[PDB]
Structure formats: C-alpha cells, structure tokens
Fold this protein.
Amino acid sequence: THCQENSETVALCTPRIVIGNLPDGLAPGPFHELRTWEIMEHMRLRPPP
Amino acid sequence: SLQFIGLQRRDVVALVNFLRHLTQKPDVDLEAHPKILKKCGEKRLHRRTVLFNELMLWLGYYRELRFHNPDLSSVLEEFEVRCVAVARRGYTYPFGDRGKARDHLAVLDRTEFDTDVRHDAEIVERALVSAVILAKMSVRETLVTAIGQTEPIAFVHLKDTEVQRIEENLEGVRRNMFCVKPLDLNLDRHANTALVNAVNKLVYTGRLIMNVRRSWEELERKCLARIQERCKLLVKELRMCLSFDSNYCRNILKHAVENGDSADTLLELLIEDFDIYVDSFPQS
Amino acid sequence: FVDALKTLCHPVLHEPAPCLQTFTERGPPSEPAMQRLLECRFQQEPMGG
C-alpha cells in the first residue's frame, strides 16, 4: 500500500499472515467453503456430528 | 417575565438586572459570572427548588442570547464587496500559471451568502483559503501540497505589530460578540502589492465573521447542554413523589429542548400555569 | 502440489524485498483517479486513556 506520513507519501509492505487475507475476487468465499469440506472429509467428518 | 420560588426579592431583582445589562459587560458567558449561579442558593434550599431556579435562570439567559444575536448583514456586504475587489485585482496580475489562478478566481467570484445564519463560516473559509492561495502565488512563497491537507489561513507579509493588534481585536470580539466594531486596518500603499493588500483586508473581515459565529455557536451549545441536563435531573428528582401537581410538573418538563423555539415553548409553558406545580415544591 | 515443494518452500518466494524496492522506485501513481486510493493515515497512539 501507499500511505501518508507527516505530509509525505510512503510505501508499506506487510505479510498476509493467514490464507484468509487473500482478496475475495482472488480467493472467494465459496472456495473457502469447499476447502473446508475437503479438510473435513480428510478428517472423516464428512457427515459432521 | 422570569419568576421562580424560594428567593428574596433583592436576589430576584439582582439577577434580572444582570440579564438586562448582559450585552454591556465583558465575558458574556454565564460561567464567567459564578456569583450569579450561587445566587440560586445551593446548600441554601432544597434540591428541587434550587434545580428549578437554575433551570429558569438558564432558560432566561438562553432567551437573552437568542434575542441579542447580532445582525451580521452589514459586514457580510463588505465581505462580498471585498471578494469582488480581490477577484478583479487577481484577474490582471501576471501570474506564471494562469490555470490554477483562474480556478481560484472562479471559486472567489462565485461566493455569496444565502441568508442562512449557520452557513456563513464555511463560505468564508472557502473564500479565504482561495484568496490566501492567490496571494501566496503572487508573492511566490511556497504553498502546501500534501494530499489531504489545505493551506492555513494567515496574513501575507503583514507588519508584525499590526498582526498582533488584529489578533487582540479578534480576541476582544471572542470575549463579547455583540458590540463588535472593526476599524483596525493600518495597511498602507507603499509596501506589498495591491493584490496582497486586498487579500489581507478580505481575510481580516472573514476571520472576524468566523470568530463571532463560532463563539455564538459554542455558547449556545453549552447553554443547551446545561438546560437538558437540568431538566433530566429535575425530572428524576420529582418522579419519586406521585401526585397531581408533581405529575403536571413532570409532564411539562418532559418536553425536549434542542432548538430556540423549543426553549421558548418550555419557558412560556412553565410561566403560564406556574400555579399548578408550585404547590408541589418545598420551601426553606 | 507435494512434488512442487522443490520450489514452493525456497526462500526466494518468501522474500518480498525486491518487490518492495521496485514498488518504491516506481513511485505513487500520478493519475487523478488513483489519488483517492493514495490517501490514508495510520497513527501510533498511547493506550493509557
């Protein structure tokens, strides 16, 4: 991002700590739902309690 | 007029003449005169009656403020004239970049007042920032460019002693906003261009208008807050005793106050049927 | 994906420093539309009160 610092514009870089922070248009919600289903099936919780 | 319980007539006449001579004293703020407040008699009377007295005093003070509200129209006309003069003089100046100069000339020449008493300050600020930008460009001193930021309003190349004198006059206006009379411009024809001189006069007039309006608005807001909180406290105090007169007083007090008209209605309603709720209040 | 680990876990992917450097060198956008995206302020403040 670009940001303001006492009348100057500066650049800022930060890590996306978790996979959820990816933009929706680039990793949408339905994809997260399907990935959660995948990991649940891997854990044998495919029909959950 | 104002009338309330529990006070000997000397204190009554004292405070009503205080209201009468309100406009002709410095520090027209009520809290600037604490002896008037304690005249209501805290620790002297019961909580109910002292709250009633303070509420009545604040209502009367608000009415006096709203009545004495200055007719700024005289100096608004001069401000418009000076905006026109600054624009006309700024057209002919040989600016290096005519584009942004023409933009600021346009915003200057568009300015006018719509007779809404609350809208004056922002119009003045817009005109003043454009004029100061033009003056700074004319003297070609540097000007702010950071995004989300605007040029501060200040005099350009004005003599320091005259600057502090103008600040003193503006402080005097801020102390008492009703007797304002500006005359102070000792500006001269020798130093500084004519455009700079016009901008300085315009910014003086505009800042005077801004200061008077802001002072009045702040004082009114404080008065409204005091009235509202007094009404809340008095209603809570009175609610514990269920009785016809107490219920009548509570129903009167339940009216919300957020405008001068609402304050007038509440004050007149308290005055008109004072007999009903006076029986409920204790004395001494 | 498990075969791709020869690349996916190499340090070069996780170093953002050259990307930040070129991002700074290019500078903030000059287009007027991009300006609305340029303005943001972040303040460090004491937590006492």
Summary: The helical segments of chain C are 5-8, 11-14, 17-26, 32-38. The interface with chain B takes residues 35, 38-39, 41 of chain C (CB under 8 Å). The CA atoms of residues 29 and 35 of chain C lie 7 Å apart.
